[PDB]
Amino acid sequence: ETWWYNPSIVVHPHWREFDQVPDAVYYSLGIFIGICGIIGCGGNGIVIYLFTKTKSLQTPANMFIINLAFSDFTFSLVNGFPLMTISCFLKKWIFGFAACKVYGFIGGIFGFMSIMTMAMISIDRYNVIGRPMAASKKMSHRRAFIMIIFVWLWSVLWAIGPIFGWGAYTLEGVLCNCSFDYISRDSTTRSNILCMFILGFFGPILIIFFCYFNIVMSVSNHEKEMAAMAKRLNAKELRKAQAGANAEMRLAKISIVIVSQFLLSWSPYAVVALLAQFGPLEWVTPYAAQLPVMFAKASAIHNPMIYSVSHPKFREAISQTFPWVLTCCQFDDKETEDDKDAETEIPAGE
Ligand SMILES: *C/C=C(C)/C=C/C=C(C)/C=C/C1=C(C)CCCC1(C)C
Ligand SMILES: CCCCCCCCO[C@@H]1O[C@H](CO)[C@@H](O)[C@H](O)[C@H]1O
């Protein structure tokens, strides 16, 4: 009678008026997300393993990185295999409503968690690079720990709504994965959506911009400052300080790329969702929603690869532990030089 009926979840009428996408599409979708499961869990596992165990990567701020990897690891695990991948190969989410809720809720909770964690990372960047060298402040375990606690509370807060009726996680697109209902336009649903977008998304974004734009509108504040202290009878020991700023700067740059990655990955889907809740629902087709959600889902598998091609200490560790990964990205000692000088302290003028 129908090719979309789910005896465990009521499919919104909107996704029911369409025809059922070809088998090949379901199979590809399954294989696709499954491979995000592998790369995602694999790569984030590696960052969690190496960062918690390498001596070099032992500073408080790195906790954010670990927190981000835990976030992306779980996203990739829960959102790929087996909940979605298996659903695809059968062309039906066979894991019932509760699974669906857990799935959608986990997806939202860690998507909110990866940007907010990046926000905390953008803050650390601002304290070490965004403020004047004289006031430069490094991350402390105390601060860091409190910050991630905020991250977790925050993330759960803006994602748990649909768990209590203030919105809802249900099926979308080809009905083989779960998400938050962006179709239904009632007061309740719409407020939760507005909350998700503004508190969950725009929020950490402001923190990010305010921190990076603050690091940019300080490159010169630092440019001058570097000189004033430079000619300040500061011996060749000035090089040390310089290397440190380079080293930190590089990390700050990294931060921005992963943030860019996040935004480029989610914004599309975000947009398609808003059209469905505020614009021509007739646009949000099976593929209009599906394809942009896959692009979003894979977001949680990028940071680890970004780190492996631009994070020196991390790249060092990999060469020393799972060095096979660094094949096409060969390691070398020169990549760690700026970190060497930045810490090779000088004994009383030396
Ligand atoms: C298949 C994965 C799903 C359905 C993910 C659910 C994710 C959320 C509810 C994410 C919320 C958002 C962000 C983390 C940033 C971009 C904009 C939002 C509000 C859609
Ligand atoms: C890419 C995400 C950026 C996270 C920034 C990681 C912050 C680590 O920055 C680290 O600070 C240490 C000071 O205790 C320095 O010794 C390290 O060289 C520097 O890489």
UniProtKB/Swiss-Prot annotation:
In this chain, where does the modification N6-(retinylidene)lysine occur? K297
Coiled-coil intervals in this record?
none
Which GO molecular function entries does the Swiss-Prot or TrEMBL record give?
G protein-coupled receptor activity; photoreceptor activity; retinal binding
List all membrane-crossing ranges.
26-50, 63-89, 102-123, 144-164, 192-216, 254-275, 286-307
Which residue spans belong to the Cytoplasmic compartment? 51-62, 124-143, 217-253
Question: Which GO biological-process labels does this protein carry?
Answer: phototransduction; visual perception
| Keyword Lipoprotein included in the entry's annotation | yes
Q: Tissue-wise, where is it found?
A: Retina, rhabdomere membrane of photoreceptor cells (at protein level).
Q: Residue ranges under compositional bias (Acidic residues)? A: 335-344
Bilayer topology annotation: Multi-pass membrane protein
Claim: Membrane is one of the keywords in the record: yes
Q: Which UniProt keywords apply?
A: Cell membrane, Cell projection, Chromophore, Disulfide bond, G-protein coupled receptor, Glycoprotein, Lipoprotein, Membrane, Palmitate, Phosphoprotein, Photoreceptor protein, Receptor, Retinal protein, Sensory transduction, Transducer, Transmembrane, Transmembrane helix, Vision
Which residues form each disulfide bond in the chain? C100-C178
What is the role of the protein in this entry? Photoreceptor required for image-forming vision at low light intensity. Light-induced isomerization of 11-cis to all-trans retinal triggers a conformational change that activates signaling via G-proteins. Signaling mediates the activation of phospholipase C. Subsequent receptor phosphorylation mediates displacement of the bound G-protein alpha subunit by arrestin and terminates signaling.
What is stated as this protein's family in its record? Answer: Belongs to the G-protein coupled receptor 1 family. Opsin subfamily.
The protein's name is: Rhodopsin
Native organism: Todarodes pacificus (Japanese flying squid)
Q: What is the lineage of its organism?
A: Eukaryota, Metazoa, Spiralia, Lophotrochozoa, Mollusca
